[PDB]
Design an enzyme around this catalytic site. Structure first.
Site, PDB file in Angstrom:
ATOM      1  N   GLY A 287       0.624  -1.125  -0.171  1.00 52.99           N
ATOM      2  CA  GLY A 287      -0.165  -0.153   0.429  1.00 52.99           C
ATOM      3  C   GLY A 287       0.752   1.254  -0.136  1.00 52.99           C
ATOM      4  O   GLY A 287       1.339   2.000  -0.664  1.00 52.99           O
ATOM      5  N   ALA A 288       1.652   0.986   1.344  1.00 57.89           N
ATOM      6  CA  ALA A 288       2.834   2.508   0.958  1.00 57.89           C
ATOM      7  C   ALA A 288       3.455   2.357   2.518  1.00 57.89           C
ATOM      8  O   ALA A 288       2.961   1.341   3.193  1.00 57.89           O
ATOM      9  CB  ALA A 288       1.882   4.090   1.290  1.00 57.89           C
ATOM     10  N   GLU A 290       7.180   4.756   4.109  1.00 51.90           N
ATOM     11  CA  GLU A 290       7.297   6.047   4.664  1.00 51.90           C
ATOM     12  C   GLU A 290       8.381   6.221   4.569  1.00 51.90           C
ATOM     13  O   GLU A 290       9.467   6.235   4.910  1.00 51.90           O
ATOM     14  CB  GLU A 290       6.873   6.194   5.816  1.00 51.90           C
ATOM     15  N   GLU A 324       1.549   8.942   5.221  1.00 51.74           N
ATOM     16  CA  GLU A 324       3.255   8.913   5.042  1.00 51.74           C
ATOM     17  C   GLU A 324       4.207   9.728   4.805  1.00 51.74           C
ATOM     18  O   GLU A 324       5.123  10.311   5.043  1.00 51.74           O
ATOM     19  CB  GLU A 324       3.135   8.344   3.747  1.00 51.74           C
TER      20      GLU A 324
END
Ligand SMILES: *[C@@H]1O[C@H](CO)[C@@H](O[C@@H]2O[C@H](CO)[C@@H](O[C@@H]3O[C@H](CO[C@H]4O[C@H](CO)[C@@H](O)[C@H](O)[C@@H]4O)[C@@H](O)[C@H](O[C@H]4O[C@H](CO[C@H]5O[C@H](CO)[C@@H](O)[C@H](O)[C@@H]5O)[C@@H](O)[C@H](O)[C@@H]4O)[C@@H]3O)[C@H](O)[C@H]2NC(C)=O)[C@H](O)[C@H]1NC(C)=O
Ligand SMILES: *[C@@H]1O[C@H](CO[C@@H]2O[C@@H](C)[C@@H](O)[C@@H](O)[C@@H]2O)[C@@H](O[C@@H]2O[C@H](CO)[C@@H](O[C@@H]3O[C@H](CO[C@H]4O[C@H](CO)[C@@H](O)[C@H](O)[C@@H]4O)[C@@H](O)[C@H](O[C@H]4O[C@H](CO)[C@@H](O)[C@H](O)[C@@H]4O)[C@@H]3O)[C@H](O)[C@H]2NC(C)=O)[C@H](O)[C@H]1NC(C)=O
Ligand SMILES: *[C@@H]1O[C@H](CO)[C@@H](O[C@@H]2O[C@H](CO)[C@@H](O[C@@H]3O[C@H](CO[C@H]4O[C@H](CO)[C@@H](O)[C@H](O)[C@@H]4O)[C@@H](O)[C@H](O[C@H]4O[C@H](CO)[C@@H](O)[C@H](O)[C@@H]4O)[C@@H]3O)[C@H](O)[C@H]2NC(C)=O)[C@H](O)[C@H]1NC(C)=O
Ligand SMILES: *[C@@H]1O[C@H](CO)[C@@H](O[C@@H]2O[C@H](CO)[C@@H](O[C@@H]3O[C@H](CO[C@H]4O[C@H](CO)[C@@H](O)[C@H](O)[C@@H]4O)[C@@H](O)[C@H](O[C@H]4O[C@H](CO)[C@@H](O)[C@H](O)[C@@H]4O)[C@@H]3O)[C@H](O)[C@H]2NC(C)=O)[C@H](O)[C@H]1NC(C)=O
Ligand SMILES: *[C@@H]1O[C@H](CO[C@@H]2O[C@@H](C)[C@@H](O)[C@@H](O)[C@@H]2O)[C@@H](O[C@@H]2O[C@H](CO)[C@@H](O[C@@H]3O[C@H](CO[C@H]4O[C@H](CO)[C@@H](O)[C@H](O)[C@@H]4O)[C@@H](O)[C@H](O)[C@@H]3O)[C@H](O)[C@H]2NC(C)=O)[C@H](O)[C@H]1NC(C)=O
Ligand SMILES: *[C@@H]1O[C@H](CO[C@@H]2O[C@@H](C)[C@@H](O)[C@@H](O)[C@@H]2O)[C@@H](O[C@@H]2O[C@H](CO)[C@@H](O[C@@H]3O[C@H](CO[C@H]4O[C@H](CO)[C@@H](O)[C@H](O)[C@@H]4O)[C@@H](O)[C@H](O)[C@@H]3O)[C@H](O)[C@H]2NC(C)=O)[C@H](O)[C@H]1NC(C)=O
Ligand SMILES: *[C@@H]1O[C@H](CO)[C@@H](O[C@@H]2O[C@H](CO)[C@@H](O[C@@H]3O[C@H](CO)[C@H](O)[C@H](O[C@H]4O[C@H](CO)[C@@H](O)[C@H](O)[C@@H]4O)[C@H]3O)[C@H](O)[C@H]2NC(C)=O)[C@H](O)[C@H]1NC(C)=O
Ligand SMILES: *[C@@H]1O[C@H](CO)[C@@H](O[C@@H]2O[C@H](CO)[C@@H](O[C@@H]3O[C@H](CO)[C@@H](O)[C@H](O)[C@@H]3O)[C@H](O)[C@H]2NC(C)=O)[C@H](O)[C@H]1NC(C)=O
Ligand SMILES: *[C@@H]1O[C@H](CO)[C@@H](O[C@@H]2O[C@H](CO)[C@@H](O[C@@H]3O[C@H](CO)[C@@H](O)[C@H](O)[C@@H]3O)[C@H](O)[C@H]2NC(C)=O)[C@H](O)[C@H]1NC(C)=O
Ligand SMILES: *[C@@H]1O[C@H](CO)[C@@H](O[C@@H]2O[C@H](CO)[C@@H](O)[C@H](O)[C@H]2NC(C)=O)[C@H](O)[C@H]1NC(C)=O
Ligand SMILES: *[C@@H]1O[C@H](CO)[C@@H](O[C@@H]2O[C@H](CO)[C@@H](O)[C@H](O)[C@H]2NC(C)=O)[C@H](O)[C@H]1NC(C)=O
Ligand SMILES: *[C@@H]1O[C@H](CO)[C@@H](O)[C@H](O)[C@H]1NC(C)=O
Ligand SMILES: *[C@@H]1O[C@H](CO)[C@@H](O)[C@H](O)[C@H]1NC(C)=O
Lengths: 904, 147
Positions: A287-288, A290, A324
């Site tokens: 998904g994401a 950081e 993020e």
């Protein structure tokens, strides 16, 4: 003993602490005659803190080119004479490279370790990996990096523990045709690789001190949309050339700037770095991530097509960008020593994501959906005896597999729920001051949750206005060191509050122990007949009394205003009625978030048999006067189970007529504000309730809603290329049009499904084709599943579970899954669990349980694969379903029949 | 620039029409009035002649959900601008009739508006107000209008 040996312990020895790394990697994005491969070369500088004779460093899936005798070479900074390497060994389980030295290292002396290695650029979504994508028939492959937790060691030998922060010099040898990206901007312009001139050498600037899991290096032919902020920071949104040409990643650029600014002022800390590269990867299951200055995202979470994407996608991209980007300060600048405390990093961001997204889109009022999307989501799982405390001892998290278990709903959503409650008693401005104090004092360092509490307590000490009865440490210890949440029962006649561990099962076996005996220190904001009362702090005691909650006559009390706290509230029957009469006399008096509370809480209490099911259904009576989303969604979510158990039963007619009477006003409200469904609203909450109004009014038989579906679909059949239906209402209109029509409608949507390129539309049309009322059409559609030229492999499970949702398709699909079990297990058992949960979700009779039991015995030799737990779980759910129906069918029927005319 | 002349003011009213969810004709507020250019400004046109004539040019366009008017009106959507009297003591027809005024300025901005005409779209089924055209008038006999 062998067990004692440092290389057989998962946690790193603290004898050597690294300073900086020099990592040079060459992604070979062309297949070998036998495998895509990467070649690397690293040099780490470390300081010995305690004399050791062995260098233990992390190495996973790395083949090493021997320098001189062994795999590594050791040198010495300063006058440090490096001991000779006797032997090098590789432990695979603990992912370690043990370098045995002939003579011990010296205390406080610096040493340097060179290594040359090679690894596989595999499609493992771990470390330096390859992401394959097909663009215009051409299969293109890119090299990207997910380093979360254990994976960084897979790419270069490093001390992969978040507490061992260092500065990194990343150099990339990539093809000149492809671009090179990393956490930092290139030191200079790319210079051709002398040895092979078809390659370039991008050497990036030195990274700030940071953890190995936040490192990123991506080689791809991607394109970008640039923008320099007033704060002199470069914002670049990277994506596949096709997406950037169509301008899909322009909303991301429009919001990233304002969001970084908000967090800069909120945290009172300037953005640590000068660049915010945000890339959208074709296949990104995570998904994401950081990664600092190279935040990798899934295409669905960074790109927004304004001509095809619904407002749901606009919410996903703005909130995930806010999450993020919040990590760039809270989680990357001040990291956490270990994963035992992962909840603080993800919970804080999961709370401040809504804050940052509100700055970007203030018209949406996103700061109010945290109750619905995060608190209510996690309470469903925290109300089970199988839940777990937010914080566990650091000694308990060692295995890479034990590290991954910390990534869950409790750590993210309950973490945010507990930190939103803090920002409530602490007053937010104090909370911001403490977070700022924390990011300024522990910058470029690692922290313990105590380190944040200390700073937030100090903020209260530098103030005299806000005074808390207990310490921040103790109040939060009750919510982080024990599992579950409390249910506050208030007897308004005597003013006595009571707390109890809320478990949704009426009979539940909580076996997990707690130091606080499942009693919490609860912050209780209250309202007495519309006027806010003084704040209360209920102690860690089962029952207490206070005249704040002592009502007389028409006086009613409502607790947890805005659902700031993490607890359920129950009152005496009389006060519930006085709340229900207020929701009828006049609802504005009770806030919107608390109007959803009286629905979510009552239904959840009814599941636990604390209140009757009639009280829960009573909370759904003010909805004929409700135009807000949260109160309506809280009911439609709770009444989904009622429909699932009663859609094929005697009591569905009464249910449909009641929900028709209650949704008719809402449909007419939007009909008016949208000028007969022409000009749609512009607030996320309103656009969501429009979908709820349209869909609900239709699946419950509103005459006008059927005319709107017919008209919109009619205009679409003419002029097929230009679609009249609004991107948000398309899914409802498509499903309804198929159910209301027959073969001609189905054959149209099928042709359009087989012609559409956008996966967004394809999935809407595919799920709509499962709404057919024709038995023969559904069975044909079920046979389309078996062939992967009609329905993709990954779309099969979502296609089958969609047909199973149709009341006519439940039987057809269960039969289809039993008869084709072997084939489905051999492909999805290696996802399949969710199929056996979508089907067997309506199971509510002893006869259906017997069928499930007989099938288990028949298909024992094949086996249930991943869903072996699910087939057993379905039996336990069916048995629990049979109990509910037996004890609630009569009461639900009578209530629905009595309140069929709607509410007053 | 002679006061004693005939100035023809062509009120080009581009009309935006959107199809409803029940197929009904719905008139978008995004339809635009283009007054003749004066003083390098299309927002306001003041008559500087003894004789004037106000004429309306109407164009129909169609948008879909997007609000981008990319096509021509068809069927129910097609309509023609009709400037209703609105808050004024005089009709748009009376002005081109024997009517005398010292000063007459049509402005799209309500600043200084002594009065406001209501521009509407007349579909075969109904006429729906879209935008408003403001008029600043001074009673007199210096200026008059006719066909
Ligand atoms: C990744 O990249 C980063 C840079 O982006 C690398 O950081 C650099 O690391 C090197 C090595 O640590 C640094 O180089 C050394 O810095 C010494 C201090 O320099 C500083 O102070 C100066 C004022 O005193 C100031 O002007 C300067 O700007 C800086 O602030 C400097 O003294 C060194 O140069 C001398 O010393 C060298 C070796 O040390 C001698 O002395 C010891 C002790 O007696 C002795 O044991 C040793 O044998 C030497 O005699 C010597 O080789 C030189 O000839 C000279 O005498 C040297 O410049 C550099 O400053 C860092 N740069 C930055 C920007 O941080 C990082 O190292 C790299 N990662 C890896 C793995 O290398
Ligand atoms: C927005 O939509 C509104 C509803 O739209 C209707 O329903 C949707 C689902 C579609 O079917 C759409 O095609 C429908 O129009 C719409 O309001 C409606 O507008 C129509 C047209 O103006 C009205 O029709 C007229 O009704 C009167 C009678 O009114 C009485 O009966 C109706 C039921 O039929 C009741 O609802 C009323 O309360 C009254 O009891 C008729 O007399 C009239 O026809 C007469 O005139 C014509 C022309 O001379 C003659 O040929 C006929 O013989 C008759 O003499 C129309 O039939 C409809 O009543 C009205 N409904 C409501 C509830 O308001 C609205 O206009 C739309 N607005 C926009 C934004 O465009
Ligand atoms: C529980 O949750 C509710 C909802 O979040 C809170 O009620 C909100 O309180 C905030 C306080 O900041 C309100 O925000 C302010 O609204 C003012 C207008 O009030 C109303 O009227 C408008 C127009 O009809 C409505 O749209 C609006 O929803 C309200 O009903 C504004 O004038 C304020 O502007 C001020 O602050 C901004 C900050 O950016 C400045 O730029 C301005 O110059 C100005 O100083 C502000 O926007 C919010 O509107 C309220 N919502 C509602 C619906 O009531 C409760 O306070 C909260 N309670 C608890 C116990 O926590
Ligand atoms: C009355 O006059 C108004 C202006 O006062 C006109 O509205 C403009 O319409 C044009 C198109 O004719 C708009 O320009 C277009 O913008 C689209 C995307 O922008 C969206 O967001 C903006 C900002 O809110 C809106 O203004 C806009 O309407 C959209 O909602 C583009 O997708 C359009 O694409 C066109 O240009 C691109 C290249 O840029 C081409 O590739 C496309 O193929 C296509 O040709 C276009 O760029 C303009 O922004 C609108 N301004 C507004 C709404 O004020 C009305 O059209 C007109 N109404 C009538 C005739 O009745
Ligand atoms: C008010 O809040 C401050 C902390 O917040 C700072 O001040 C506010 C006004 C803002 O400007 C923030 O941005 C600032 O960050 C509290 O200060 C802390 O006080 C405690 C004592 O109560 C200090 O703890 C002591 O630390 C001694 C060693 O200090 C040195 O080392 C630390 C790092 O280890 C370093 O941070 C500090 O600057 C010194 O170099 C130690 O010997 C002693 O035994 C004790 O542990 C703590 O260090 C202070 N922190 C900071 C960052 O100043 C105030 O106490 C608080 N006031 C009240 C009344 O509560
Ligand atoms: C304002 O707008 C008018 C049009 O307004 C229309 O007419 C008035 C009377 C009202 O009824 C309004 O409601 C109407 O909408 C513009 O007038 C047009 O000007 C253009 C300028 O190019 C003229 O185009 C010319 O057309 C000629 C062909 O027809 C004319 O000539 C032939 C002989 O060649 C003759 O037989 C015929 O009778 C016409 O006289 C062509 O030869 C010439 O080269 C040129 O293309 C157009 O004819 C005019 N139409 C009318 C009806 O006025 C004004 O230009 C505009 N002016 C201002 C100041 O706003
Ligand atoms: C890790 O990675 C960093 C870069 O990210 C390396 O640091 C760089 O080292 C090189 C080589 O020492 C530096 O380039 C030198 O700079 C000096 C001072 O300005 C001189 O200009 C050097 O030129 C002279 O020496 C060469 C070689 O003998 C000779 O060919 C030439 O004619 C001159 O006599 C020049 O090469 C560079 O500036 C450093 N960059 C930074 C930012 O520090 C570091 O060495 C790497 N460490 C390891 C162990 O791999
Ligand atoms: C790989 O390295 C080479 C060498 O640095 C890169 O060549 C560079 O290409 C860019 C354009 O993409 C050039 O920019 C332009 O250069 C011309 C001079 O011919 C000038 O007129 C323009 O003002 C502009 O700056 C750059 O100069 C050029 N550098 C060279 C030829 O030395 C190549 O693009 C690199 N590719 C990657 C992915 O690194
Ligand atoms: C399946 O999808 C393809 C691709 O979208 C559709 O092809 C499209 O067909 C339409 C209708 O023929 C083309 O529209 C054209 O409009 C222009 C004016 O703008 C006109 O001059 C042409 O004669 C034509 O009418 C459109 O260009 C074309 N697009 C492409 C890229 O092929 C196809 O019709 C779809 N079939 C369906 C919906 O079943
Ligand atoms: C790293 O080395 C291992 C062997 O230690 C390689 O695995 C071998 O790959 C070859 C070619 O496919 C096989 O014939 C061997 O049987 C494999 N052996 C083992 C133990 O796996 C691996 O491919 C190398 N990886 C890279 C990218 O260099
Ligand atoms: C649900 O609300 C209904 C009213 O809408 C409640 O019914 C009332 O119950 C009281 C106490 O038995 C009676 O005195 C009233 O006459 C009833 N009114 C009606 C109209 O039935 C019902 O008690 C509520 N149920 C719960 C559990 O809250
Ligand atoms: C970032 O900007 C600062 C100045 O604000 C500068 O000192 C630093 O070197 C820059 N780092 C880069 C270019 O990555
Ligand atoms: C609860 O768990 C314990 C330990 O497994 C068991 O002994 C006990 O019988 C269980 N009780 C219930 C109510 O299931």
């Amino acid at each position: 003993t062998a067990q004692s040996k440092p290389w057989n312990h998962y946690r790193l020895p603290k004898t050597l602490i690294p300073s900086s790394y020099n990592v040079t990697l060459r992604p070979y994005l062309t297949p070998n005659s036998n495998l895509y491969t990467f070649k690397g070369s690293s040099t780490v500088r470390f300081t010995c803190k305690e004399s050791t004779s062995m260098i233990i460093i992390h190495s996973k899936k790395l083949n090493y080119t021997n320098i001189q005798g062994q795999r590594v070479a050791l040198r010495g900074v300063g006058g440090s004479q490096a001991p000779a390497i006797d032997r090098t060994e590789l432990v695979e389980v603990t992912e370690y490279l043990v370098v045995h030295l002939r003579e011990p290292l010296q205390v406080n002396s610096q040493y340097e370790m060179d290594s040359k290695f090679e690894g596989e650029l595999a499609d493992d979504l771990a470390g330096f990996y390859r992401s394959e994508y097909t663009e215009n028939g051409v299969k293109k492959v890119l090299a990207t990096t997910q380093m979360q937790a254990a994976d960084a060691r897979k790419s270069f030998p490093c001390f992969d523990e978040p507490a061992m922060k260092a500065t990194f010099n990343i150099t990339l040898i990539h093809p000149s045709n492809l671009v090179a990206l990393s956490n930092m901007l290139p030191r200079g312009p790319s210079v051709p690789f002398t040895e092979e001139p078809n390659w370039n050498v991008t050497e990036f600037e030195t990274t700030p001190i940071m953890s190995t899991y936040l490192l990123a290096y991506i080689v791809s032919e991607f394109k970008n949309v640039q923008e320099n902020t007033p704060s002199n920071v470069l914002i670049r949104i990277w994506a596949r050339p096709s997406a950037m040409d169509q301008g899909h990643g322009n909303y991301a650029l429009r919001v990233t700037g304002p969001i970084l600014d908000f967090f800069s002022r909120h945290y009172d800390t300037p953005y640590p770095l000068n660049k915010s590269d945000q890339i959208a990867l074709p296949d990104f299951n995570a998904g994401a991530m950081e990664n600092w200055g190279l935040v990798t995202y899934r295409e669905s979470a960074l790109l927004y097509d304004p001509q095809s994407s619904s407002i749901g996608n606009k919410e996903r991209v703005v909130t995930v960008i806010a999450h993020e980007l919040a990590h760039q300060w809270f989680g990357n600048l001040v990291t956490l020593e270990w994963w035992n405390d992962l909840w603080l990093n993800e919970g804080f961001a999961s709370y401040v994501e809504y804050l940052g997204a509100d700055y970007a889109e203030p018209t949406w009022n996103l700061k109010d959906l945290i109750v619905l999307n995060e608190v209510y989501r996690v309470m469903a799982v925290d109300a089970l005896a199988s839940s777990h405390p937010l914080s566990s001892p650091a000694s308990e998290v060692n295995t890479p597999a034990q590290i991954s278990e910390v990534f869950d709903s409790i750590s993210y959503s309950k973490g945010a729920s507990v930190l939103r409650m803090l920002s409530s008693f602490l007053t937010e401005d104090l909370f911001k001051k403490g977070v700022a104090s924390y990011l300024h004092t522990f910058a470029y360092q690692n922290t313990i949750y105590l380190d944040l509490w200390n700073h937030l307590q100090w903020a209260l000490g530098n103030q005299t206005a806000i005074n808390l009865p207990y310490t921040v440490n103790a109040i939060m210890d009750r919510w982080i060191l024990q599992m579950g949440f409390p249910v506050v029962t208030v007897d308004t006649t005597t003013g006595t509050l009571s707390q109890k561990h809320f478990l949704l099962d009426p009979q539940s076996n909580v076996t997990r122990p707690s130091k606080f005996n499942y009693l919490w220190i609860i912050p209780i904001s209250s309202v007495k007949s519309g006027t806010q009362q003084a704040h209360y702090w209920m102690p860690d005691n089962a029952k207490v009394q206070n005249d704040l909650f002592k009502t007389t006559g028409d006086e009613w009390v409502l607790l947890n205003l805005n659902v700031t706290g993490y607890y359920l509230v129950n009152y005496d029957q009389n006060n519930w009625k006085k709340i229900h009469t207020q929701l009828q006399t006049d609802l504005s008096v009770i806030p919107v978030i608390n109007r959803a509370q009286v629905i979510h809480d009552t239904f959840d209490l009814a599941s636990a048999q604390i209140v009757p099911v009639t009280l829960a259904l009573n909370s759904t009576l003010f909805l004929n006067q409700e135009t807000e989303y949260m109160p309506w969604e809280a009911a439609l979510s709770s009444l989904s189970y009622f429909k699932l158990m009663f859609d094929r039963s005697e009591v569905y007619g009464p249910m449909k007529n009641y929900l028709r009477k209650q949704v008719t006003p809402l449909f007419n409200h939007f009909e008016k504000i949208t000028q007969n469904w022409t000009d749609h609203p512009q607030t996320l909450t309103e656009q969501y309730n429009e979908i709820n109004a349209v869909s609900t009014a239709c699946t419950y038989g509103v005459p006008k809603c059927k005319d709107l579906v017919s008209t919109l679909f009619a205009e679409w059949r003419k002029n097929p290329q230009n679609n009249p239906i609004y991107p948000n209402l398309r899914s409802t209109v498509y499903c309804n049009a198929i159910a209301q029509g027959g073969e001609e409608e189905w054959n149209f949507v099928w042709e359009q499904f087989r012609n559409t390129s956008l996966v967004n539309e394809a999935d809407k049309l595919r799920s709509a084709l499962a709404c057919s009322t024709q038995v023969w059409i559904l069975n044909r559609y079920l046979s389309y599943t078996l062939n992967p030229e009609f329905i993709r492999k990954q779309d099969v499970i979502s296609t089958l579970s969609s047909i199973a949702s149709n009341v006519i398709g439940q039987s057809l699909a269960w039969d289809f899954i039993q008869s084709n079990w072997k084939k489905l297990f051999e492909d999805y058992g290696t996802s399949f669990s969710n199929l056996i949960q979508a089907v067997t979700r309506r199971f509510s009779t002893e006869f259906e349980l017997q069928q499930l039991e007989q099938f288990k015995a028949n298909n024992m030799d094949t086996g249930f694969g991943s869903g072996t737990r699910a087939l057993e779980q379905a039996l336990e759910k069916t048995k629990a379903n049979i109990k509910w129906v037996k004890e609630n069918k009569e009461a639900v029927l009578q209530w629905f029949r009595e309140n069929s005319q709607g509410g007053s | 620039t002679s006061f004693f002349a005939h100035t023809t003011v062509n009120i080009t009213i581009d009309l935006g029409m959107k199809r409803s969810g029940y197929g009904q004709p719905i008139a978008s507020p995004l339809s635009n009035i283009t007054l003749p250019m004066q003083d390098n400004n299309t927002d306001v046109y003041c008559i500087r002649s003894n004789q004037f004539s106000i004429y309306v040019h109407s164009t129909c366009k169609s948008s879909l959900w997007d609000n981008v008017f990319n096509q021509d009106c068809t069927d129910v959507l097609e309509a023609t601008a009709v400037i209703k009297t609105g808050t004024c003591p005089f009709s748009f027809d009376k002005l081109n009739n024997h009517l005398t005024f010292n000063k007459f300025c049509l402005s799209l901005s309500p600043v200084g508006a002594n009065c406001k005409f209501d521009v509407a779209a007349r579909t075969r089924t109904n006429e729906q107000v879209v935008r408003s055209l403001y008029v600043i008038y001074e009673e007199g006999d210096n200026i008059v209008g006719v066909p």
